[PDB]
RNA sequence: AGGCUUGUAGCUCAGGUGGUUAGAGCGCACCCCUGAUAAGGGUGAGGUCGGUGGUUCAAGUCCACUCAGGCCU
């Protein structure tokens, strides 16, 4: 098997994935999504509303776009970063599937 | 002379109310909140326990376990109370204290799992209860139990056919488990022999997994506000060879139609109820669906969702 | 072939269910929670609008004012939304955000009166509105409108008689306005001619104003938390000639029996629903009532009372 | 005059055998956070690939000639 080197996009897509997990996939964000999926509020400090569903649609678009970049590659640093993207999506979808039914 | 022996037998026989101000008077609304726990799920909380008693697995001594965070937990709680059985509902810690008061005052044993795992932590906990003593606990599995679409083939199928006198041309129902869409389409297309029925499913646009399954695509689930539908996967009760069309509904136009369906009609309707009516409005914008009688399932009431964002101020 | 033309035509035909674990098993509960606004009031919230259309006073162009915050405010809200009228409910300012959000959702103009007054302030502003433009507003007056006991003679009375097949011996119903007790007792004692029916009335012990009127004493009300019954006076719809017994249910006995009616028999019951079953249990302590078909009305659902004292569990 | 070489988003730049159209860093707009600033994170906008022709199933990439800069001359 011929090992390859990264583009400037694949090495961007690795650093986007690892920073999306350590800042947007906290346990607070999966709580606040499920609070928002059936309506009951998590308010702001003095008014307004924190929209956790829009911030998880953004996280799911990010982790799916940045895993499609790193999908058919052959660098072991980029196949290992693909594993964190697929496992982070499976962490989200296992919290969402069959909810409210 | 009909005295009911318990409240689980009082399911069904719900009105088919014509909508006079949402649409052109052809949309017929089947109010499914006229049930003993005020959801469409009351039909399946009765028949899944009826079926378990017929095939001998539900004896005196056998308890009931099912992971749920919706109207199925209310529907299993009154039938286990009416028939006289025990129930344990596993669910995340996210849901409200006012939802847990309705289940605990109705005779359920709530097991609250940690909310960061979501429903899989609520699902996988229900197997450690069953694997503790498998001869004692029963798992109902609403997404794969064939008693879920069979209550709709026996009850809510013939109710639509006898109210419309066989004139229903389009049937529209949202799909959370798929027993309602499959059972009605089995009675009208299969038993009564009307192949021309158009069975339209309703899904969220933020999780359009039925349209991705029909188009051969990878499954793309996501969070949505239309509670009741949008499972994130294709369940075993949904038969995709009967789904003739699928219409996606955004979260703001589902909440907008439910507020119309209260204010202009007097029907207390949840978000999934307004999502299914708005699919009938999107379908009637086509000019071939203007002399068609449309039957729309309205699965829940709005009073249950009264602390939510359906009621703004 | 039955397609209902609006949601208000779907009242009635509520099932009569046997209570197997409460009593000896001859209590027959009629669950009035399965009406289109989930109360007993849907029947009178529809008939009083149907009667006003036929009297010629509810034309296209006239309003509806009713000093009412409870179940019959919800019942007038969905019928006026189903049939196209405009509703203005007058009620005190000390009411919950939650019930006000259910009434704006059905399209009801809510006018808020002073909280130091209470209910008699809500009545007085309703007659201030009708006195402004008498041709354009309209009261309904559920305590004195004869369409309140008329619909129970046309719907509730037959549904008890044709489901029991003529075997109802005792009829327990709570009296808040005295329509469901009057209408069914006029059907069975009057039309079908069964004078042996024992029509009893459930009242609070803190406000026993029906027992003070039958004993010839001064009517003195009091506060209670069996909401739905106990108006504090004898309404004009309640005729005392039909009432045989009067049973006073204590406020903790209604909470305990409604919880007992949910967890043992699967019926979502409010506080007044538990008060009416508790009167059936007090009546079965006599051996003369243990072979009687007790028929009891369950007027509301416990999911509406979900923030009240009925749910003291975490 | 010859042999070469630079030209890709507002700036500096990668672009592997001719295959996602075309991508990164800084900067612009929005969102989380910092009482606030910096630091740090995410999403989006921005492209006659110098110009014109040829070839190929397909050209930013391969050729032919020009336009502007640097090298010995
Ligand atoms: Mg966060
Ligand atoms: Mg440049």
PDB file of N, CA, C and O in Angstrom, chain A residues 19-70:
ATOM      1  N   UNK A  19     -10.933  20.308  16.875  1.00  0.00           N
ATOM      2  CA  UNK A  19     -11.391  21.482  17.606  1.00  0.00           C
ATOM      3  C   UNK A  19     -12.907  21.544  17.691  1.00  0.00           C
ATOM      4  O   UNK A  19     -13.442  22.188  18.598  1.00  0.00           O
ATOM      5  N   UNK A  20     -13.614  20.913  16.757  1.00  0.00           N
ATOM      6  CA  UNK A  20     -15.068  20.867  16.854  1.00  0.00           C
ATOM      7  C   UNK A  20     -15.500  19.944  17.985  1.00  0.00           C
ATOM      8  O   UNK A  20     -16.494  20.208  18.666  1.00  0.00           O
ATOM      9  N   UNK A  21     -14.739  18.879  18.226  1.00  0.00           N
ATOM     10  CA  UNK A  21     -15.077  17.959  19.302  1.00  0.00           C
ATOM     11  C   UNK A  21     -14.788  18.588  20.660  1.00  0.00           C
ATOM     12  O   UNK A  21     -15.612  18.515  21.578  1.00  0.00           O
ATOM     13  N   UNK A  22     -13.643  19.251  20.804  1.00  0.00           N
ATOM     14  CA  UNK A  22     -13.253  19.745  22.115  1.00  0.00           C
ATOM     15  C   UNK A  22     -13.940  21.047  22.506  1.00  0.00           C
ATOM     16  O   UNK A  22     -13.676  21.560  23.598  1.00  0.00           O
ATOM     17  N   UNK A  23     -14.805  21.595  21.659  1.00  0.00           N
ATOM     18  CA  UNK A  23     -15.464  22.855  21.954  1.00  0.00           C
ATOM     19  C   UNK A  23     -16.956  22.865  21.659  1.00  0.00           C
ATOM     20  O   UNK A  23     -17.652  23.762  22.141  1.00  0.00           O
ATOM     21  N   UNK A  24     -17.472  21.910  20.893  1.00  0.00           N
ATOM     22  CA  UNK A  24     -18.886  21.945  20.551  1.00  0.00           C
ATOM     23  C   UNK A  24     -19.589  20.653  20.933  1.00  0.00           C
ATOM     24  O   UNK A  24     -20.813  20.634  21.089  1.00  0.00           O
ATOM     25  N   UNK A  25     -18.843  19.562  21.046  1.00  0.00           N
ATOM     26  CA  UNK A  25     -19.394  18.307  21.551  1.00  0.00           C
ATOM     27  C   UNK A  25     -19.023  18.092  23.011  1.00  0.00           C
ATOM     28  O   UNK A  25     -18.335  17.146  23.376  1.00  0.00           O
ATOM     29  N   UNK A  26     -19.501  18.992  23.848  1.00  0.00           N
ATOM     30  CA  UNK A  26     -19.447  18.779  25.278  1.00  0.00           C
ATOM     31  C   UNK A  26     -20.705  18.049  25.719  1.00  0.00           C
ATOM     32  O   UNK A  26     -21.635  17.837  24.941  1.00  0.00           O
ATOM     33  N   UNK A  27     -20.730  17.650  26.988  1.00  0.00           N
ATOM     34  CA  UNK A  27     -21.930  17.006  27.498  1.00  0.00           C
ATOM     35  C   UNK A  27     -23.036  18.015  27.739  1.00  0.00           C
ATOM     36  O   UNK A  27     -24.208  17.642  27.785  1.00  0.00           O
ATOM     37  N   UNK A  28     -22.682  19.290  27.881  1.00  0.00           N
ATOM     38  CA  UNK A  28     -23.680  20.342  28.019  1.00  0.00           C
ATOM     39  C   UNK A  28     -24.446  20.548  26.726  1.00  0.00           C
ATOM     40  O   UNK A  28     -25.627  20.905  26.748  1.00  0.00           O
ATOM     41  N   UNK A  29     -23.798  20.304  25.590  1.00  0.00           N
ATOM     42  CA  UNK A  29     -24.420  20.598  24.305  1.00  0.00           C
ATOM     43  C   UNK A  29     -25.383  19.496  23.878  1.00  0.00           C
ATOM     44  O   UNK A  29     -26.346  19.757  23.150  1.00  0.00           O
ATOM     45  N   UNK A  30     -25.148  18.258  24.316  1.00  0.00           N
ATOM     46  CA  UNK A  30     -26.086  17.184  24.007  1.00  0.00           C
ATOM     47  C   UNK A  30     -27.297  17.258  24.933  1.00  0.00           C
ATOM     48  O   UNK A  30     -28.419  16.922  24.533  1.00  0.00           O
ATOM     49  N   UNK A  31     -27.097  17.719  26.173  1.00  0.00           N
ATOM     50  CA  UNK A  31     -28.218  18.028  27.066  1.00  0.00           C
ATOM     51  C   UNK A  31     -29.086  19.126  26.475  1.00  0.00           C
ATOM     52  O   UNK A  31     -30.301  18.959  26.324  1.00  0.00           O
ATOM     53  N   UNK A  32     -28.473  20.254  26.113  1.00  0.00           N
ATOM     54  CA  UNK A  32     -29.232  21.404  25.648  1.00  0.00           C
ATOM     55  C   UNK A  32     -29.916  21.199  24.313  1.00  0.00           C
ATOM     56  O   UNK A  32     -30.849  21.928  23.975  1.00  0.00           O
ATOM     57  N   UNK A  33     -29.470  20.213  23.541  1.00  0.00           N
ATOM     58  CA  UNK A  33     -30.166  19.863  22.312  1.00  0.00           C
ATOM     59  C   UNK A  33     -31.466  19.150  22.627  1.00  0.00           C
ATOM     60  O   UNK A  33     -32.520  19.477  22.066  1.00  0.00           O
ATOM     61  N   UNK A  34     -31.403  18.179  23.539  1.00  0.00           N
ATOM     62  CA  UNK A  34     -32.568  17.387  23.892  1.00  0.00           C
ATOM     63  C   UNK A  34     -33.575  18.191  24.703  1.00  0.00           C
ATOM     64  O   UNK A  34     -34.770  17.901  24.646  1.00  0.00           O
ATOM     65  N   UNK A  35     -33.113  19.185  25.467  1.00  0.00           N
ATOM     66  CA  UNK A  35     -34.029  20.132  26.103  1.00  0.00           C
ATOM     67  C   UNK A  35     -34.794  20.924  25.050  1.00  0.00           C
ATOM     68  O   UNK A  35     -36.002  21.158  25.182  1.00  0.00           O
ATOM     69  N   UNK A  36     -34.109  21.296  23.970  1.00  0.00           N
ATOM     70  CA  UNK A  36     -34.662  22.106  22.897  1.00  0.00           C
ATOM     71  C   UNK A  36     -35.502  21.294  21.925  1.00  0.00           C
ATOM     72  O   UNK A  36     -36.358  21.866  21.245  1.00  0.00           O
ATOM     73  N   UNK A  37     -35.273  19.981  21.838  1.00  0.00           N
ATOM     74  CA  UNK A  37     -36.039  19.177  20.894  1.00  0.00           C
ATOM     75  C   UNK A  37     -37.477  19.004  21.335  1.00  0.00           C
ATOM     76  O   UNK A  37     -38.354  18.807  20.492  1.00  0.00           O
ATOM     77  N   UNK A  38     -37.747  19.058  22.630  1.00  0.00           N
ATOM     78  CA  UNK A  38     -39.123  19.086  23.101  1.00  0.00           C
ATOM     79  C   UNK A  38     -39.445  20.364  23.870  1.00  0.00           C
ATOM     80  O   UNK A  38     -40.270  20.354  24.785  1.00  0.00           O
ATOM     81  N   UNK A  39     -38.815  21.464  23.504  1.00  0.00           N
ATOM     82  CA  UNK A  39     -39.309  22.795  23.855  1.00  0.00           C
ATOM     83  C   UNK A  39     -38.989  23.527  25.142  1.00  0.00           C
ATOM     84  O   UNK A  39     -39.022  24.756  25.163  1.00  0.00           O
ATOM     85  N   UNK A  40     -38.713  22.807  26.229  1.00  0.00           N
ATOM     86  CA  UNK A  40     -38.569  23.481  27.522  1.00  0.00           C
ATOM     87  C   UNK A  40     -37.270  24.284  27.579  1.00  0.00           C
ATOM     88  O   UNK A  40     -36.231  23.834  27.080  1.00  0.00           O
ATOM     89  N   UNK A  41     -37.310  25.507  28.103  1.00  0.00           N
ATOM     90  CA  UNK A  41     -36.231  26.460  27.830  1.00  0.00           C
ATOM     91  C   UNK A  41     -34.983  26.278  28.675  1.00  0.00           C
ATOM     92  O   UNK A  41     -35.024  25.837  29.827  1.00  0.00           O
ATOM     93  N   UNK A  42     -33.858  26.646  28.069  1.00  0.00           N
ATOM     94  CA  UNK A  42     -32.624  26.989  28.764  1.00  0.00           C
ATOM     95  C   UNK A  42     -32.334  28.455  28.445  1.00  0.00           C
ATOM     96  O   UNK A  42     -31.856  28.763  27.344  1.00  0.00           O
ATOM     97  N   UNK A  43     -32.626  29.386  29.344  1.00  0.00           N
ATOM     98  CA  UNK A  43     -32.613  30.804  28.974  1.00  0.00           C
ATOM     99  C   UNK A  43     -31.209  31.394  28.991  1.00  0.00           C
ATOM    100  O   UNK A  43     -30.232  30.759  29.386  1.00  0.00           O
ATOM    101  N   UNK A  44     -31.134  32.648  28.553  1.00  0.00           N
ATOM    102  CA  UNK A  44     -29.896  33.411  28.606  1.00  0.00           C
ATOM    103  C   UNK A  44     -29.761  34.051  29.987  1.00  0.00           C
ATOM    104  O   UNK A  44     -30.495  33.728  30.926  1.00  0.00           O
ATOM    105  N   UNK A  45     -28.812  34.979  30.128  1.00  0.00           N
ATOM    106  CA  UNK A  45     -28.523  35.537  31.445  1.00  0.00           C
ATOM    107  C   UNK A  45     -29.576  36.558  31.873  1.00  0.00           C
ATOM    108  O   UNK A  45     -29.892  36.663  33.062  1.00  0.00           O
ATOM    109  N   UNK A  46     -30.131  37.322  30.923  1.00  0.00           N
ATOM    110  CA  UNK A  46     -31.164  38.293  31.267  1.00  0.00           C
ATOM    111  C   UNK A  46     -32.261  38.392  30.209  1.00  0.00           C
ATOM    112  O   UNK A  46     -33.053  39.343  30.241  1.00  0.00           O
ATOM    113  N   UNK A  47     -32.331  37.445  29.279  1.00  0.00           N
ATOM    114  CA  UNK A  47     -33.312  37.509  28.214  1.00  0.00           C
ATOM    115  C   UNK A  47     -32.783  36.990  26.893  1.00  0.00           C
ATOM    116  O   UNK A  47     -31.595  37.135  26.593  1.00  0.00           O
ATOM    117  N   UNK A  48     -33.659  36.390  26.094  1.00  0.00           N
ATOM    118  CA  UNK A  48     -33.242  35.756  24.858  1.00  0.00           C
ATOM    119  C   UNK A  48     -33.303  34.251  24.978  1.00  0.00           C
ATOM    120  O   UNK A  48     -33.958  33.732  25.888  1.00  0.00           O
ATOM    121  N   UNK A  49     -32.624  33.532  24.084  1.00  0.00           N
ATOM    122  CA  UNK A  49     -32.633  32.078  24.129  1.00  0.00           C
ATOM    123  C   UNK A  49     -31.395  31.536  23.432  1.00  0.00           C
ATOM    124  O   UNK A  49     -31.008  32.025  22.368  1.00  0.00           O
ATOM    125  N   UNK A  50     -30.788  30.518  24.033  1.00  0.00           N
ATOM    126  CA  UNK A  50     -29.627  29.848  23.469  1.00  0.00           C
ATOM    127  C   UNK A  50     -30.103  28.672  22.630  1.00  0.00           C
ATOM    128  O   UNK A  50     -30.667  27.712  23.163  1.00  0.00           O
ATOM    129  N   UNK A  51     -29.872  28.748  21.324  1.00  0.00           N
ATOM    130  CA  UNK A  51     -30.411  27.802  20.352  1.00  0.00           C
ATOM    131  C   UNK A  51     -29.387  26.690  20.161  1.00  0.00           C
ATOM    132  O   UNK A  51     -28.504  26.782  19.310  1.00  0.00           O
ATOM    133  N   UNK A  52     -29.512  25.630  20.961  1.00  0.00           N
ATOM    134  CA  UNK A  52     -28.570  24.526  20.868  1.00  0.00           C
ATOM    135  C   UNK A  52     -28.826  23.633  19.667  1.00  0.00           C
ATOM    136  O   UNK A  52     -27.919  22.900  19.261  1.00  0.00           O
ATOM    137  N   UNK A  53     -30.031  23.660  19.097  1.00  0.00           N
ATOM    138  CA  UNK A  53     -30.294  22.848  17.915  1.00  0.00           C
ATOM    139  C   UNK A  53     -29.607  23.386  16.677  1.00  0.00           C
ATOM    140  O   UNK A  53     -29.185  22.601  15.823  1.00  0.00           O
ATOM    141  N   UNK A  54     -29.505  24.705  16.547  1.00  0.00           N
ATOM    142  CA  UNK A  54     -28.797  25.276  15.413  1.00  0.00           C
ATOM    143  C   UNK A  54     -27.303  25.031  15.538  1.00  0.00           C
ATOM    144  O   UNK A  54     -26.608  24.859  14.532  1.00  0.00           O
ATOM    145  N   UNK A  55     -26.798  24.974  16.767  1.00  0.00           N
ATOM    146  CA  UNK A  55     -25.378  24.723  16.962  1.00  0.00           C
ATOM    147  C   UNK A  55     -25.020  23.250  16.819  1.00  0.00           C
ATOM    148  O   UNK A  55     -23.835  22.916  16.727  1.00  0.00           O
ATOM    149  N   UNK A  56     -26.004  22.353  16.806  1.00  0.00           N
ATOM    150  CA  UNK A  56     -25.698  20.954  16.544  1.00  0.00           C
ATOM    151  C   UNK A  56     -25.937  20.575  15.095  1.00  0.00           C
ATOM    152  O   UNK A  56     -25.307  19.635  14.598  1.00  0.00           O
ATOM    153  N   UNK A  57     -26.840  21.274  14.409  1.00  0.00           N
ATOM    154  CA  UNK A  57     -26.913  21.162  12.956  1.00  0.00           C
ATOM    155  C   UNK A  57     -25.638  21.679  12.305  1.00  0.00           C
ATOM    156  O   UNK A  57     -25.217  21.176  11.260  1.00  0.00           O
ATOM    157  N   UNK A  58     -25.011  22.686  12.913  1.00  0.00           N
ATOM    158  CA  UNK A  58     -23.731  23.176  12.422  1.00  0.00           C
ATOM    159  C   UNK A  58     -22.614  22.190  12.723  1.00  0.00           C
ATOM    160  O   UNK A  58     -21.682  22.038  11.925  1.00  0.00           O
ATOM    161  N   UNK A  59     -22.691  21.512  13.867  1.00  0.00           N
ATOM    162  CA  UNK A  59     -21.690  20.512  14.212  1.00  0.00           C
ATOM    163  C   UNK A  59     -21.830  19.273  13.336  1.00  0.00           C
ATOM    164  O   UNK A  59     -20.825  18.686  12.920  1.00  0.00           O
ATOM    165  N   UNK A  60     -23.061  18.887  13.005  1.00  0.00           N
ATOM    166  CA  UNK A  60     -23.261  17.727  12.144  1.00  0.00           C
ATOM    167  C   UNK A  60     -22.892  18.023  10.695  1.00  0.00           C
ATOM    168  O   UNK A  60     -22.440  17.125   9.978  1.00  0.00           O
ATOM    169  N   UNK A  61     -23.095  19.259  10.232  1.00  0.00           N
ATOM    170  CA  UNK A  61     -22.620  19.617   8.898  1.00  0.00           C
ATOM    171  C   UNK A  61     -21.106  19.685   8.852  1.00  0.00           C
ATOM    172  O   UNK A  61     -20.499  19.351   7.830  1.00  0.00           O
ATOM    173  N   UNK A  62     -20.484  20.135   9.939  1.00  0.00           N
ATOM    174  CA  UNK A  62     -19.037  20.209   9.970  1.00  0.00           C
ATOM    175  C   UNK A  62     -18.392  18.842   9.969  1.00  0.00           C
ATOM    176  O   UNK A  62     -17.502  18.565   9.165  1.00  0.00           O
ATOM    177  N   UNK A  63     -18.860  17.953  10.843  1.00  0.00           N
ATOM    178  CA  UNK A  63     -18.217  16.654  10.985  1.00  0.00           C
ATOM    179  C   UNK A  63     -18.506  15.751   9.796  1.00  0.00           C
ATOM    180  O   UNK A  63     -17.759  14.802   9.546  1.00  0.00           O
ATOM    181  N   UNK A  64     -19.577  16.023   9.049  1.00  0.00           N
ATOM    182  CA  UNK A  64     -19.854  15.217   7.866  1.00  0.00           C
ATOM    183  C   UNK A  64     -19.124  15.744   6.639  1.00  0.00           C
ATOM    184  O   UNK A  64     -18.751  14.964   5.758  1.00  0.00           O
ATOM    185  N   UNK A  65     -18.935  17.058   6.542  1.00  0.00           N
ATOM    186  CA  UNK A  65     -18.161  17.600   5.431  1.00  0.00           C
ATOM    187  C   UNK A  65     -16.683  17.294   5.600  1.00  0.00           C
ATOM    188  O   UNK A  65     -15.987  16.988   4.626  1.00  0.00           O
ATOM    189  N   UNK A  66     -16.181  17.371   6.830  1.00  0.00           N
ATOM    190  CA  UNK A  66     -14.763  17.153   7.068  1.00  0.00           C
ATOM    191  C   UNK A  66     -14.390  15.684   7.175  1.00  0.00           C
ATOM    192  O   UNK A  66     -13.197  15.372   7.206  1.00  0.00           O
ATOM    193  N   UNK A  67     -15.361  14.781   7.237  1.00  0.00           N
ATOM    194  CA  UNK A  67     -15.067  13.362   7.120  1.00  0.00           C
ATOM    195  C   UNK A  67     -15.151  12.875   5.688  1.00  0.00           C
ATOM    196  O   UNK A  67     -14.525  11.865   5.348  1.00  0.00           O
ATOM    197  N   UNK A  68     -15.916  13.561   4.841  1.00  0.00           N
ATOM    198  CA  UNK A  68     -15.955  13.195   3.433  1.00  0.00           C
ATOM    199  C   UNK A  68     -14.662  13.574   2.730  1.00  0.00           C
ATOM    200  O   UNK A  68     -14.292  12.948   1.733  1.00  0.00           O
ATOM    201  N   UNK A  69     -13.966  14.594   3.235  1.00  0.00           N
ATOM    202  CA  UNK A  69     -12.629  14.908   2.754  1.00  0.00           C
ATOM    203  C   UNK A  69     -11.654  13.788   3.085  1.00  0.00           C
ATOM    204  O   UNK A  69     -10.894  13.342   2.221  1.00  0.00           O
ATOM    205  N   UNK A  70     -11.683  13.309   4.328  1.00  0.00           N
ATOM    206  CA  UNK A  70     -10.735  12.332   4.841  1.00  0.00           C
ATOM    207  C   UNK A  70     -11.209  10.902   4.659  1.00  0.00           C
ATOM    208  O   UNK A  70     -10.781  10.017   5.409  1.00  0.00           O
TER     209      UNK A  70
END
